[PDB]
Amino acid sequence: KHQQAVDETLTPWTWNNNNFSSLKITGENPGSFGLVRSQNDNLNISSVTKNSSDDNLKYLNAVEKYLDGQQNFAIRRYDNNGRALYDINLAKMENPSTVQRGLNGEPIFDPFKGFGLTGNAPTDWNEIKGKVPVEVVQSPHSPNLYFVLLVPKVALEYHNLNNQVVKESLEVKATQSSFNPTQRLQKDSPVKDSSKQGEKLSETTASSGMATSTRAKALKVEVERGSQSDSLLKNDFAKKPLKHKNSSGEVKLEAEKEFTEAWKPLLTTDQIAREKGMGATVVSFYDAPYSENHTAFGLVDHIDPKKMVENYPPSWKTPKWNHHGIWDYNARNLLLQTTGFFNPRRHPEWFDEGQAKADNTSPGFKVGDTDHKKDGFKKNSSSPIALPFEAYFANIGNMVAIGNSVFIFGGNGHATKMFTTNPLSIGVFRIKYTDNFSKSSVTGWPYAVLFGGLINPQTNGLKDLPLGTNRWFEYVPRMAVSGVKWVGNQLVLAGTLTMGDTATVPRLKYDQLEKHLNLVAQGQGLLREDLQIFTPYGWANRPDIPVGAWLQDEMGSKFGPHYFLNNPDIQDNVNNDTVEALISSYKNTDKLKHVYPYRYSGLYAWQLFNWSNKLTNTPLSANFVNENSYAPNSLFAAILNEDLLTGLSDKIFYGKENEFAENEADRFNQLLSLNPNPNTNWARYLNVVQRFTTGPNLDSSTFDQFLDFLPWIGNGKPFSNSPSASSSTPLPTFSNINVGVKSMITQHLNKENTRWVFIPNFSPDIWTGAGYRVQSANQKNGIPFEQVKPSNNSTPFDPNSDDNKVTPSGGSSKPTTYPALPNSISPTSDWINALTFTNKNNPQRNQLLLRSLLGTIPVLINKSGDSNDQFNKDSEQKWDKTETNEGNLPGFGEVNGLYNAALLHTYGFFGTNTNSTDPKIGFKADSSSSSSSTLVGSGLNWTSQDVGNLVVINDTSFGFQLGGWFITFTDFIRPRTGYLGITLSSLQDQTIIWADQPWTSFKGSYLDSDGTPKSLWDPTALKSLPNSSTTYDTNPTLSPSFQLYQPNKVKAYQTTNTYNKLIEPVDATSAATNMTSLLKLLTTKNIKAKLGKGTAGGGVSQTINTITTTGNISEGLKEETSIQAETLKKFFDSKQNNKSEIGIGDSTFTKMDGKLTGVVSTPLVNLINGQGATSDSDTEKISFKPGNQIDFNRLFTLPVTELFDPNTMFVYDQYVPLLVNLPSGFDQASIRLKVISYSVENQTLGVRLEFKDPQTQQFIPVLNASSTGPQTVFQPFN
C-alpha cells in the first residue's frame, strides 16, 4: 500500500495565476517538488446545474464535488537528477499523519527511519484533501520543512463555470439593432438649478495697498460650526446651485436602473472566510526523500480574506468619498463622474455586492439634504472595500519563507481575470510560525500601507509618477505579481502596479459633457482606459473650483476669472502687480477660503502636476489623489525590507489621523500631514519599499527618445519610423527632435526656475514637435497674444480691458496677460520652461512604455478602409506640413503625448508596414467638413496582467516575461551610470503575437543551466474567444484588449493657423449613427483582418545575448553639443541597425515536439515536462562498498567517533576509500562522506556520498552510491 508511489497518469503542469511548475530544492537532499496533474478531458461542468433556488455558493460546492470525482492533482518529489521519487496526492492519501514533535516543538526525525508520525490527520483534512497544490516553497533555515499552497478545484475551472454565474462587467444585450458605444453612458450635462440661487457663492465686501484692479472680486467660501448637532452655522462648500438634467427622470448615476443584470463576485469576503474549503490554504509539511517515513504533515492555515480586510485603512470603509468631501462630491456627481478614491462603478471586483453599489449614493456622509448646511456629516455606509472571490484568488500565489514567517504576495490575477475585469493582488499575507513551526498566526497588510513611504529619490528613472498617498490612504496600489525573489542579498518584488488615476485628473466645464464623451466615460467607469485621452477644450481652468463658483459668468462673455474653459493663453502673469491685486488682496482665515479671480489654467502636465498624486521628496504628501487605475499601468520592481516584513506586528492600528472628518467644519481646517498618536502603529508599515524601478533609468524628454527606439511586436517596425528618397518621409510618434520647427529659448514662466547664471557652450533651442503654432515661417520665436481665445458670440477677448489690466500706486494700467506664448499646444507639446503649455508628462510616458511593449496603444480613426472611406497616404498625408491640417494631427480625441499619424504609420494602418497592400486606414484632418472620429485598438490582445514568473539571472539582475517581451532589470540592484538598465527580448511566433487570447500559450519562464533565461510557449494551448454566437453575430466582440471608445466630433480644421487655438469639439451623442464602418473596428478581429493577420512554433524562447558593456547609452546622454534628449535621439538613430548593442532584440527560439506543460527544475537540471533525466556520468563509477567488503578491524572495532571530525562531521580523508569504491586513479578530494547519524553505543555510521561537481565547485550527492540513494548505514556484521 505505497500510498504515495509515483502515479504515471499524472504529468507536470503550470498554474496560470503564478506560473509555478516546480520548486528547485536546494541543500542536503536536493531535487524538485513539481506540480502534477491528470489529463482527462470531457468534463462538462455543464452537467452541474443551478436550479435558481440556492445561490452561487450552493452551485460552487456542487461543482467542487463534481471536479472532486473527475480531476486529480499531487506534487511529486524528484531527485537531484530529475527522476521522480514519490508523489504526495492529498486526495488519495488514506492515512495522512502529522509529525511527532519534542516538547520544544521540534519534529522527531532520524535520517534513515524518517519522521515520527502521530497517526493523526492534519486539522480540517476533509476540506483540504480535495484542494489542488499550486505552489511549494522550502524553509531556508529549517531543514525538511516545506510549504504547500492549496486552492479549490473550482478556482482552476473558474472560467468554465455557468455564463450566468461567471460573467463580464460590460453588459452585452442580445440585440441586432445597431451599435452605439454611448448607449450605456450618461452624457447629459447639468443645468442651473433656479430653485436655489442663494447657493451661488458671494463676492468679498472690502479690505495703502499699492496694486489695484477692476477685476471681479474673489468668491468667499465661509464655514462655521455653530451650536447644532446635525447642522453647520455656515457650510459654503455644500452650496450646489446646479442640478442633473431632467429627462422626466434625472440624468444621474443609478446602479438600480443601470445594472439590471449587475456583475457580482463568485463569493463574498465573508463566504470565503466561513467556507474553509472555498479558500486558499497553506500547509506546512516535512520531507526527507531517502528516509523511510519520508513525508509528514505539520500546520494547516487557511488564508482568511478577513485577516487582510481587517488591516485596510479606515478610509476604505467609505470609498465613495474622499478628504476633500462634499465640495468634490457634488462637483464629480453633477459632472456624471465617479465619486471617491475607489468607487464600485470603477473597480467592482473589490466590492462584496459588485455593480449593485455602482453609483454615488450613500457615500457614508449626508448628501443632497433639503438644507445644504446639514450635508457632509458622517452617516451610515453600506459600500466598503472588501476581498471577494475574484480579487481574493488574484492575491493567491507567489509565496516566500523569510525566517519564521511565510509570505503570500499574490499572482498575476489571470485565474479570475475576464476581458472586462481586473482582479489584482491588493496586499501581502503572512503566516508567522512559532515554537519550531508548531504554532502559527495569519495576517494581511494592503500594499497601500506598505508603499506609504514612497518618494521620488527611490527611483532612478521617471520622476513624479502618481504613487503618492496621504493620512487617509486614497492611493490603492494593486499588483499583477511576477514574483518575490532574492537577487543576491536583496529581496525583490516585481510585476506590474496600478498607479494613481492620471487620465481623469482634469475636470470638465459643466456644459462641455456631450462634446467630450471619451473623457466622460473614463470618469463614468464605462471606458476602462488608463491612458490620457487628449480632449482638452472642455476642461475647466481648475478641477478644484467648487459648484457655487460655476455660475458667476454663465454667458461666458466676462471670461469668468473664477471658472472658465481652460486656456493657458488667457492665464495671468506672475508680475508683483498682478499677484498683489488679484491674490494677496484677499486673505483666507479660520472660517473663510477664497475662489480667487486670478486666471489660472494649463494643459495636461500642469493639471497633473497640481492635482495628481505625484511622488515628491516627502511621503504621504499627495493632497490630491484623483482615483485609481483600472488595469496595471506601470512596470514595477522594488527592493523590500526583509526585517520589516518579518518584524511588523499582525494587527495594524490606525488613528483618528487616518479617518475622514465627521463634519465639513472639522474638514475645513484639515492639515494634510498629521503626527501619528502614540497608541497607533500604522506609521511603522510605510517603509517596506527601500528602492524601486518602473522601467529604464531615463527621465522626461530623454525617455521619449527611447520610446521611439523600441519597436512594435505586431510589425517589427519601430515607433521612430527613422529608416528610409522623399521629403514626405514619416516622422517619429514620441519624439519632438527634428519634428516641426526649432523655437528659441527665453520666457521662464513660474516657480522662479530663473537661473541664467550659467549659460551652456551650445544654443539650447527646443523643437516644437508636430501640431505647432507659428506667427509666420520667418518668425518662429514665440507667438504673440493676438492668436487669442475669441470665444463668446465670436467677440474676442480684449487683453487691455479694464478688468484684464492692473494699475500700481502711481498709475499706468498694464494688462495681466502674457505678450507671447509657446509655439505648441498639441498633445506632443514638450515645453521645459512652460509647464502650463506642456502636455507630455512622465505619468503618461510610464504607461506608454508598458503599452508599447504590450503594443496596445490606441489610434484615432477618421477613415476606415472600406471602398468609400479610404486614406490615400500619398495625397492626404504631408509629413512636412505638420503646422496645417495636412499634418493630420487630430489635436482632439487621440492618446495624449504622441503624434497619431506617426503611430498609425508605425502600426501599418496606412502603408506597407503590416499589409503588403496598403490597408488605407487613418485620420484625415478635414478642412471641408465636421470630423467624426473614434479610437481603435492595434489588433493585439496582450494585457498588463500578462506577467510571467520572476527569473533571477545573477546577484544583480532579474527579469520576467511581460506579454511578448522578456524584460530584464540590469541596473536596479547595482546601478551602473550611463546604462539604460533594461533588456527586451521580443517573441518571434507571429501566430501567438496576434492571437485572440495570447498569454494562454505561455507556460512559464526558467533560467537555464547555460545561464540564459528561457520561456515555454505552446500555441496548441491558445484559448479561443468564448463562442461563435449565431453565424458569428453582427455587433462588438469582447476580447482581452477590447475597449469601449466613445466617438469624438470636431468642427472642420483650418487650412491655415490650425493649431494656433485649441481644437473645438461639438456634440457627438448622435455621431455614432454614421460611423457604422469605423465603429466596426472597435472589435479586434476586424482590424486583424484589414491588416492581413489573424487567420494562419511550439517550444522555448531564449533571450538575447547580453554582455557587461550591453546597455551603455552614456555617449547618448552627454549634453556636449545638444541637450540630453537631442544627443540621445542622434545616438539611437546611429545605432538603428544594431539595436542588440543597447539591449533590444528578437528572442531566439528552439522548436519542441508536443504540448509543453511545464518544467521540473533541480539545482542540476531543468527538464521540459519530464525530458530524459539521466544518471550522472561524473559519479557513475563511484559507489559504496558492499557490507561484506568492509575491513571491520581498522578503526571500526574502536568507537565510531574516531572515524569523523566532530567539528566538521565528515569522515576523515583516510577512511573514505575504505567505505567507497572508486575508479583506479580517482581524486579523493573531489568526494566526501558526511555523517548523517552515528551511534557509538550501537556501532552504526550513517553517511551520504557527496561529489565536487566539475561545473559549480559545490558538492552534489552521488545518487548512484546505493540501491536506495546517496545515503547508507555502516554497521559491523549486523
Author numbering: 56 to 262, 266 to 782, 787 to 1158, 1166 to 1347
What did the article's authors report about this structure?
The human pathogen Mycoplasma genitalium, a member of the pneumoniae cluster of mycoplasmas, binds to eukaryotic cells by means of its adhesion complex, the Nap. This complex is formed by two heterodimers, each consisting of proteins P110 and P1401–6. In addition to their roles in cytadherence and motility, P110 and P140 are immunodominant proteins and constitute the main target of host antibodies during infection. Here, we address the structure and mechanism of the Nap adhesion complex and reveal an intricate interplay between P110 and P140.
Crystals were obtained from the extracellular region of P140 (residues 23–1351), both alone and in complex with the N-terminal domain of P110 (P110N: residues 23–827). The structure of P140, for which there are no molecular models or experimental phases available, was determined by density modification techniques, starting with a mask derived from the sub-tomogram-averaged map of the whole Nap obtained by cryo-electron tomography (cryo-ET). The structure of the extracellular region of P140, with a bulky N-terminal domain (residues 23–1243) and a small C-terminal domain (residues 1244–1351), has an overall shape resembling the capital letter P. The N-terminal domain consists of a seven-bladed (β-sheet) propeller and a “crown” formed by the clustering of the long polypeptide segments that emerge from the propeller. β-Sheets I to VI each have four strands, while β-sheet VII, the last β-sheet in the propeller that connects directly with the C-terminal domain, has only two strands. P140 and P110 share many features of domain organization and the topology of the secondary structural elements, suggesting a common ancestor, although the degree of conservation differs for the N-terminal and C-terminal domains. The N-terminal domains, with an RMSD of 3.5 Å between the Cα atoms of 359 structurally equivalent residues (∼28%), are markedly different in the crown. In contrast, the C-terminal domains are closely related, with 74 equivalent residues (∼71%) and an RMSD of 2.2 Å.
